């Protein structure tokens, strides 16, 4: 009590100052760019929307007793905002309830009272047109509650707050939809909740109610408005078609909605990764591993974010399904040092000819392998054990006999040699041909890449790419 | 004093890690343990090294009387302040911090060297201090903190050449600049060999040359490395002295490919009884095999390995499994043949190689301007 | 030692002489400008990072 008593006054005013003003500037500035800025398809509060991705995950989690954040919600939900005299009353209330936090006690709404606090956005001539403002004020019941990671009995009130927010889809689709493009703000709000409502439906059973909801929520795209709303829901559509283990995947291929042309270099990066696992399970590898490689290098710009741990894991799995041999820890992380150690042993036994050592490690570390979601390697890895050897020889020898490639592979005999030399050409391993006069396997060399029109085929896309950047630059320049 | 102190840390680097090789090691560790007033690093070997001798009482009195020889004057100074100068005098900590590094440990060195750092602001005082932090950086081999003050002396203390701190810019190409980045920091930075003499602190020259000839033939294959190693004259005198250096040089340039396994094993036999015993040929042998092969596979585009059975060495099957290691993992650009018994080579063209190179850099810069297009503009 | 523009064959006992192309100069100077263009985007990369 003398030790913990004096440590009480400094913790409240740091959220009471800067966590007070940030959405106070955001809720003012986006409103002035909802009223003004008719071309508010890309607000500068879309980067603040990207800030609110990062802000409330680290700024505040609980409502900060000793009365710091507990008074924000009864302030910011008490918004009627009638006109300039009766909004300047509320502009005084941004200042007046600060004395209620500091001098007085705040209004403690422990996980329940925010749902009856959604009547103050109806009380005394409130505003329904500001569905960005009330849409952010429909995110704010979640923002201390969900982001505290309770997942405990207020999940149903997580749900009921989202049903009020799904009723804000209804207010977008039925109540005065006049050219404001607020869905492209609401879809990112429909993302944020349905990252955790995804997690909520991982704490419970299947989502066929939301499947009927998500198809209808996807349905209103491509006709009304289409930017990043179609995209983010499509990963939410894909991830649990993938998480459930049914056929599920040719439906994804015929789902011809792949192309909203951009997703701000974040959603489109993982979008290639979710469909990269899809194309890998139907045995296509070289087309799979090139968008596996594309997804790893598109948005890795953090430190061990968690799905970067997964795309780096799955990438050389399918490259150990062709049989080229890259291994793993050339970009190692502290969250990767533990998660490399079974995957450590997995790729060394590919190059060596010992398989009981490989069957030792699979029996040793199968529980980690089964935790990763890579059950079906062993039904097709013993395939590539002898395919890695035969490609290494065919890359080494230019004109190999059948009668010699066996005895090096501890394969005993010149028939067990070309028991690996009739599908590898059909699988696209080696160019080489076989004559039944000598039984020798000889390949040739490629020379005509510069002698014939290979380069100007590749250049025409890259000429067309560089002129697009010049076109994106000049069109987005003279805003002053 | 501290200039023959190079030997003690190097012999301590030698002893324990070869477990079988410990007979002559302890026969001169006793010279390094109880003599020269060496105090710390063997008491920390109390569960590392052998059983022990009674090294306790004979030397704890010798650390005590020699500390009592020093610890009285260093902490007090007050002596020439009787005639009131700056209320101090400069004879105390600049003269006895060197014992605090030689026999005193790094803890007595770190608190003394920073104490005499702010005492005098000259580069010539910051000359010898930073070089003592770097000499002790080899002694207790804490080889990460002393990577800092090199660059901190590269920034401020290094203002040029023009014989200077070049005395220990012999602390800028064999303690810190070329270690495990070594492909070209031995190449670009070993261009000067320009002196000979062994002064009272140049205790290692002739065996030091055996380093810089074993790392010489690495930088450039034949765009005239041969002048700086064979037409050079100061290198000519020591190969006139040392046949193991001379024959190993004159095997490679004069293209005696058969005597390489002889001349490599003599280098290998020299690498059997050397102190360097933790991480080894981070260049050498089967790159020197591919260095032997890159000049051998050059000038012959249709070669047979029956000719390899005597021109380079024996073991027809041994060469065959050797080239299978080298071709198949991205080195030694050729294509070996079976029962025709041919070693055929293929090369990129003058444009196929560059089209392969411009397609790599073009993808990196395109991926770069992908990202910066969308960081700005939403 | 580049005294001569030739090549030998062990399986033929045959010396073969070819000429020298002076061509490889445009592609050589091409990729070095890409090395300079790598740094000017890096110079713009922290410029946007320091201030939006």
């Amino acid at each position: 009590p003398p030790g913990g008593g004096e440590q009480e006054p400094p913790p409240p005013p740091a959220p009471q100052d800067v966590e007070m003003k940030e959405e106070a500037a955001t809720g003012g500035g986006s409103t002035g760019e909802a009223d003004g800025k008719t071309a508010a398809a890309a607000a500068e509060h879309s980067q603040r929307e990207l800030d609110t991705v990062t802000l409330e995950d680290i700024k505040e989690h609980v409502k900060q007793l000793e009365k710091a954040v507990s008074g924000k919600e009864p302030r910011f939900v008490l918004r009627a905002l009638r006109m300039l005299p009766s909004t300047s009353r509320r502009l005084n209330h941004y200042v007046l309830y600060k004395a209620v936090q500091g001098f007085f006690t705040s209004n403690n709404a422990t996980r329940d009272f925010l749902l009856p606090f959604l009547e103050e956005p109806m009380d005394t001539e409130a505003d329904l047109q500001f569905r960005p403002r009330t849409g952010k004020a429909a995110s704010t019941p979640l923002l201390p509650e969900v982001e505290a990671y309770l997942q405990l009995l207020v999940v149903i009130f997580m749900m009921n707050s989202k049903r009020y927010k799904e009723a804000q889809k209804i207010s977008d689709d039925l109540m005065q939809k006049i050219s404001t493009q607020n869905r492209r703000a609401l879809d990112l709000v429909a993302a944020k909740c349905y990252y955790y409502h995804a997690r909520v439906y991982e704490f419970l059973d299947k989502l066929d109610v939301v499947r009927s909801f998500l198809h209808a929520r996807l349905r209103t795209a491509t006709l009304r408005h289409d930017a990043d709303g179609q995209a983010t829901l499509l990963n939410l559509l894909l991830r649990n078609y993938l998480h459930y283990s049914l056929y599920d995947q040719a439906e994804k291929l015929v789902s011809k909605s792949v192309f909203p042309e951009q997703a701000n270099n974040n959603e489109w990066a993982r979008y290639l990764y979710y469909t990269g696992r899809i194309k890998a399970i139907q045995l296509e590898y070289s087309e799979a591993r090139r968008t596996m490689t594309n997804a790893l290098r598109k948005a890795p710009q953090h430190t061990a974010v968690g799905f970067k741990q997964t795309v780096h894991k799955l990438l050389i799995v399918v490259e150990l399904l062709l049989g080229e041999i890259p291994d793993r820890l050339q970009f190692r992380q502290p969250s990767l040092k533990r998660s490399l150690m079974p995957y450590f042993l997995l790729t060394q036994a590919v190059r060596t000819g010992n398989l009981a050592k490989f069957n030792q490690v699979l029996d040793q570390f199968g529980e980690k392998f089964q935790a990763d979601g890579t059950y079906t390697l062993i039904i097709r890895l013993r395939h590539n054990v002898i395919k890695t050897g035969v490609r290494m020889i065919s890359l080494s020898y230019s004109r190999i006999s059948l009668a010699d490639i066996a005895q090096k592979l501890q394969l005993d005999s010149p028939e067990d040699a070309e028991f690996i030399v009739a599908k590898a050409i059909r699988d696209g391993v080696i160019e080489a041909s076989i004559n039944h006069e000598k039984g020798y396997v000889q390949s040739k060399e490629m020379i005509d890449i510069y002698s014939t029109r290979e380069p100007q085929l590749a250049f025409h896309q890259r000429i067309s790419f560089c002129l697009d950047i010049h076109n994106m630059s000049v069109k987005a320049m003279r805003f002053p | 004093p501290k200039n023959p102190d190079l030997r003690i840390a190097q012999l301590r680097f030698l002893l324990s890690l070869p477990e079988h090789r410990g007979d002559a090691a302890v026969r001169d560790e006793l010279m390094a343990a109880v003599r020269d007033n060496n105090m710390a690093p063997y008491y920390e070997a109390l569960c590392k090294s052998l059983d022990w001798q009674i090294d306790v009482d004979l030397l704890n009195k010798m650390k005590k009387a020699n500390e009592d020889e020093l610890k009285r004057l260093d902490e007090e100074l007050e002596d020439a302040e009787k005639n009131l100068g700056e209320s101090e005098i400069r004879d105390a900590m600049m003269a006895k911090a060197e014992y605090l590094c030689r026999i005193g440990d790094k803890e007595g060195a770190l608190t003394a060297f920073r104490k005499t750092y702010d005492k005098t602001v000259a580069l010539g005082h910051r000359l010898d201090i930073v070089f003592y932090l770097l000499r002790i950086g080899l002694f207790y081999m804490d080889n990460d903190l002393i990577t800092r003050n090199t660059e901190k002396a590269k920034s401020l203390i290094e203002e040029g050449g023009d014989w200077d701190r070049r005395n220990r810019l012999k602390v800028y190409q064999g303690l810190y600049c070329v270690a495990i980045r070594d492909f070209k920091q031995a190449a670009e930075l070993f261009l000067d060999t320009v002196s000979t003499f062994t002064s009272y602190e140049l205790m290692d020259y002739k065996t030091f040359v055996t380093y810089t000839v074993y790392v010489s033939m690495i930088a450039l294959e034949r765009p005239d490395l041969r002048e700086k190693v064979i037409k050079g004259a100061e290198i000519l005198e020591v190969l006139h002295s040392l046949p193991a250096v001379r024959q190993y040089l004159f095997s490679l340039y004069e293209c005696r490919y058969s005597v390489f396994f002889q001349s490599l094993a003599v280098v290998e036999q020299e690498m059997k009884k050397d102190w360097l015993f933790a991480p080894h040929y981070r260049y050498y042998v089967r790159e020197m095999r591919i260095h032997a092969y890159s000049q051998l596979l050059e000038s012959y585009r249709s070669l047979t390995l029956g000719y390899m059975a005597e021109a380079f060495g024996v073991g027809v099957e041994f060469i065959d499994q050797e080239l299978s290691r080298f071709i198949a993992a991205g080195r030694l650009h050729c294509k070996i043949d079976k029962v025709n018994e041919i070693v055929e080579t293929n090369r990129p063209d003058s444009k196929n190689w560059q089209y392969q190179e411009t397609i790599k850099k073009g993808d990196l810069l395109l991926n770069r301007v992908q990202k910066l297009s969308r960081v700005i503009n939403m | 030692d580049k005294k001569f523009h030739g090549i030998l064959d062990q399986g033929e006992g045959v010396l073969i002489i070819f000429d020298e192309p002076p061509v490889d100069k445009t592609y050589e100077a091409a990729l070095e400008t890409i090395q300079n263009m790598s740094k000017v985007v890096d110079s713009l990369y922290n410029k946007a990072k320091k201030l939006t």
Binding site: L467, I469, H470, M477, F479 | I376 | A30, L44
Partner: peptide
């Protein structure tokens, strides 16, 4: 292909130089 690769980077300088001058003249005006 070389000439396009620089012309795009040149036009990208004019973005950041305008976007710095846009909002920083705005945020000091307000």
């Amino acid at each position: 292909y070389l000439a396009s690769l620089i012309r795009s980077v040149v036009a990208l300088h004019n973005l950041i130089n305008n976007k710095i001058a846009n909002r920083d003249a705005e945020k000091k005006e307000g």
